[PDB]
Write an enzyme that holds these catalytic residues in place. Structure first.
Site, PDB file in Angstrom:
ATOM      1  N   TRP A 110      -8.519  49.140  10.263  1.00 59.36           N
ATOM      2  CA  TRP A 110      -8.639  48.788   8.868  1.00 59.36           C
ATOM      3  C   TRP A 110      -7.989  49.803   7.951  1.00 59.36           C
ATOM      4  CZ3 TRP A 110     -12.232  50.785  12.047  1.00 59.36           C
ATOM      5  CH2 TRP A 110     -12.891  51.963  11.648  1.00 59.36           C
ATOM      6  N   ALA A 130      -8.440  53.162  -0.320  1.00 59.83           N
ATOM      7  CA  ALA A 130      -7.133  53.702  -0.626  1.00 59.83           C
ATOM      8  C   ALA A 130      -6.483  54.096   0.650  1.00 59.83           C
ATOM      9  CB  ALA A 130      -7.238  54.893  -1.535  1.00 59.83           C
ATOM     10  N   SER A 168     -10.911  51.450   3.003  1.00 61.90           N
ATOM     11  CA  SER A 168     -12.331  51.650   3.007  1.00 61.90           C
ATOM     12  C   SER A 168     -13.088  50.476   2.514  1.00 61.90           C
ATOM     13  CB  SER A 168     -12.718  52.811   2.142  1.00 61.90           C
ATOM     14  OG  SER A 168     -12.214  53.984   2.728  1.00 61.90           O
ATOM     15  N   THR A 181     -14.417  51.283  -3.141  1.00 60.12           N
ATOM     16  CA  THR A 181     -13.041  51.657  -3.258  1.00 60.12           C
ATOM     17  C   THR A 181     -12.395  51.672  -1.894  1.00 60.12           C
ATOM     18  OG1 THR A 181     -13.891  53.872  -3.140  1.00 60.12           O
ATOM     19  CG2 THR A 181     -13.188  53.115  -5.293  1.00 60.12           C
TER      20      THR A 181
HETATM   21  C1  DRW Z   1     -10.926  54.560   2.409  1.00 66.71           C
HETATM   22  O1  DRW Z   1     -10.191  53.748   1.738  1.00 66.71           O
HETATM   23  C2  DRW Z   1     -10.437  55.911   2.862  1.00 66.71           C
HETATM   24  C3  DRW Z   1     -11.292  56.944   2.148  1.00 66.71           C
HETATM   25  N1  DRW Z   1     -12.014  56.206   1.132  1.00 66.71           N
HETATM   26  C4  DRW Z   1     -11.866  56.818  -0.126  1.00 66.71           C
HETATM   27  C5  DRW Z   1     -12.749  56.371  -1.254  1.00 66.71           C
HETATM   28  O2  DRW Z   1     -13.160  57.187  -2.102  1.00 66.71           O
HETATM   29  O3  DRW Z   1     -13.089  55.164  -1.281  1.00 66.71           O
HETATM   30  C6  DRW Z   1     -10.933  57.795  -0.126  1.00 66.71           C
HETATM   31  S1  DRW Z   1      -9.703  57.845  -1.452  1.00 66.71           S
HETATM   32  C7  DRW Z   1     -10.119  59.515  -2.041  1.00 66.71           C
HETATM   33  C8  DRW Z   1      -9.652  59.711  -3.483  1.00 66.71           C
HETATM   34  N2  DRW Z   1      -8.787  60.899  -3.497  1.00 66.71           N
HETATM   35  C9  DRW Z   1      -9.021  61.614  -2.235  1.00 66.71           C
HETATM   36  C10 DRW Z   1      -7.721  62.287  -1.803  1.00 66.71           C
HETATM   37  N3  DRW Z   1      -7.882  62.858  -0.455  1.00 66.71           N
HETATM   38  S2  DRW Z   1      -8.132  64.472  -0.520  1.00 66.71           S
HETATM   39  N4  DRW Z   1      -6.778  65.229  -1.056  1.00 66.71           N
HETATM   40  O4  DRW Z   1      -9.267  64.780  -1.463  1.00 66.71           O
HETATM   41  O5  DRW Z   1      -8.464  64.973   0.859  1.00 66.71           O
HETATM   42  C11 DRW Z   1      -9.337  60.523  -1.228  1.00 66.71           C
HETATM   43  C12 DRW Z   1     -10.498  58.003   1.340  1.00 66.71           C
HETATM   44  C13 DRW Z   1      -8.981  57.877   1.510  1.00 66.71           C
HETATM   45  C14 DRW Z   1     -10.527  55.962   4.400  1.00 66.71           C
HETATM   46  C15 DRW Z   1      -9.920  57.233   5.008  1.00 66.71           C
HETATM   47  O6  DRW Z   1     -11.872  55.780   4.823  1.00 66.71           O
END
Ligand code: DRW
EC number: 3.5.2.6
Length: 249
Positions: free
Chosen positions: A136, A191, A46, A189
């Site tokens: 990405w 992840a 992200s 962030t």
């Molecule tokens: C980007 O890196 C991905 C999405 N961006 C996130 C962020 O907050 O920057 C999140 S990470 C977030 C933290 N814990 C959550 C776990 N997933 S759940 N069990 O709540 O469904 C996710 C997210 C991955 C990208 C997909 O855009």
């Protein structure tokens, strides 16, 4: 360059973590942890929204007033299940907004921006044929923390061939909070799980601006076995904030 291993090591224990803090204007390394990990490219996840935001504002496909219309179908995180703005896109990492934006900008222009931004490996091929909307996300596109630092520098220094407003709108949208000493924290962030592995990559990167307007860029990043709960960015961010508050910039 202050080796902050004494502070940063315990924070990244159980992960391969790193932290870089650079002076924005001068490229002076101010704080570093684990330069080896800093040189390692991984998917921006992200944090790519920083780049996408620049592209989207520069390509004039969005304005701060733009409302991204949610298609009213579940997106995977409840916070994503709503209309968004460029600000909340950033704040809540609304990937579907990114995917709308990349489709609007198109692969050619994205590729051009990746060049303009010198963005990591610039590999937007994804994969099938999903690069435009997935490249990405733990996919083809990779960038190292060091490269992210330089990208961030270019952004805040306006050393990118994009609209000044694209830069400032993007930075503004990254604003998160003030740190303990009222230093402004702007960040994003990211992840994801490593392809074909259980490992998590986490990023938290962005800008800090001191009360006097002094600008720094930082990247907190990690890869680690953090289990099934994608918390790598939470950890990266918490660590960055802990470190940044300790550095008292
Ligand atoms: C980007 O890196 C991905 C999405 N961006 C996130 C962020 O907050 O920057 C999140 S990470 C977030 C933290 N814990 C959550 C776990 N997933 S759940 N069990 O709540 O469904 C996710 C997210 C991955 C990208 C997909 O855009």
């Amino acid at each position: 360059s202050t080796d902050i291993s004494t502070v940063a090591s315990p924070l990244f224990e159980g992960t391969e973590g790193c932290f870089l803090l650079y002076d924005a204007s001068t490229n002076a390394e101010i704080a570093q942890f684990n330069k080896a990990k800093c040189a390692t490219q991984m998917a921006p996840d992200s944090t790519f929204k920083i780049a996408l935001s620049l592209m989207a504002f520069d390509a004039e496909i969005i304005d701060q007033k733009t409302i991204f219309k949610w298609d009213k179908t579940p997106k995977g995180m409840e916070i994503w299940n709503s209309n968004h703005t460029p600000k909340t896109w950033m704040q809540f990492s609304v990937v579907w907004v990114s995917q709308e934006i990349t489709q609007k900008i198109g692969l050619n222009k994205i590729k051009n921006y990746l060049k303009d931004f010198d963005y990591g490996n610039q590999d937007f091929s994804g994969d099938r044929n999903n690069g435009l909307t997935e490249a990405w996300l733990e996919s083809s596109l990779k960038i190292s923390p060091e490269e992210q630092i330089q990208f961030l520098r270019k952004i805040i220094n306006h050393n990118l061939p994009v609209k000044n407003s694209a830069i400032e709108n993007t930075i503004e949208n990254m604003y998160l909070q003030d740190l303990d000493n009222s230093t402004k924290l702007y960040g994003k962030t990211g992840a994801g799980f490593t392809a074909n592995r259980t490992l998590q990559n986490g990023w938290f990167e962005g800008f800090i601006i001191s009360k006097s307007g002094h600008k720094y860029v930082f990247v907190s990043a990690l890869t680690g076995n953090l289990g099934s709960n994608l918390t790598s960015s939470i950890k990266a961010k918490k660590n960055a904030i802990t470190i940044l508050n300790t550095l008292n910039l």
